[PDB]
């Protein structure tokens, strides 16, 4: 859809004196959270609060992995905790909206297009030590930081 949040307003109302560490750590590629990795679902918008929503009551009434997610200002990742396998390698400049939830505190996920299936995918996930929306704020950071790079080159 066309729908604009200002990242720098709300990077100002975010700020939780736990925060602080995560915007330097999605810059210098160290940031990490502890994980359930969900799964990923087809959805009808690049964008939407309630559409992710959606997306993961799908999946929570489907059938999860415990992983660590990783955010850098070049892309998203997922390691397998039992494996160490790479789940999942997403580049921060094909996502499209990302965003906590409403009524599950420690679910996240982001939508992004995937140009050979030709359809939106949400990647949700239900992170373990942390709230949802500490996540979305470091991705958030990535957003930025790689709009921010981008301006540069
Ligand atoms: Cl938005
Ligand atoms: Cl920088």
């Not at 679902?41 to 964008?47: A, D, F, K, L, Y």
């Not at 850098?72 to 390691?79: E, P």
């Not at 996920?109 to 996930?125: A, E, K, M, P, Q």
């Amino acid at each position: 859809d066309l729908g604009t949040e200002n990242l720098y307003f709300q990077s100002m109302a975010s700020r939780p004196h736990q925060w602080q560490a995560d915007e330097d750590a999605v810059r210098k590629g160290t940031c990490s959270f502890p994980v359930r990795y969900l799964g990923h679902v087809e959805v009808e918008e690049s964008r939407g609060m309630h559409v992710c929503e959606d997306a993961v009551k799908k999946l929570k009434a489907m059938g999860s992995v415990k992983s660590v997610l990783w955010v850098s200002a070049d892309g998203l990742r997922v390691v397998d905790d039992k494996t160490k396998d790479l789940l999942v390698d997403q580049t921060i400049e094909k996502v499209s909206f990302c965003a906590p939830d409403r009524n599950l505190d420690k679910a996240f996920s982001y939508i992004c297009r995937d140009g050979t299936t030709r359809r939106w995918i949400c990647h949700c996930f239900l992170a373990l030590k942390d709230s949802g929306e500490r996540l979305s704020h470091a991705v958030g950071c990535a957003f930025a930081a790689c709009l921010e790079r981008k301006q540069r080159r």
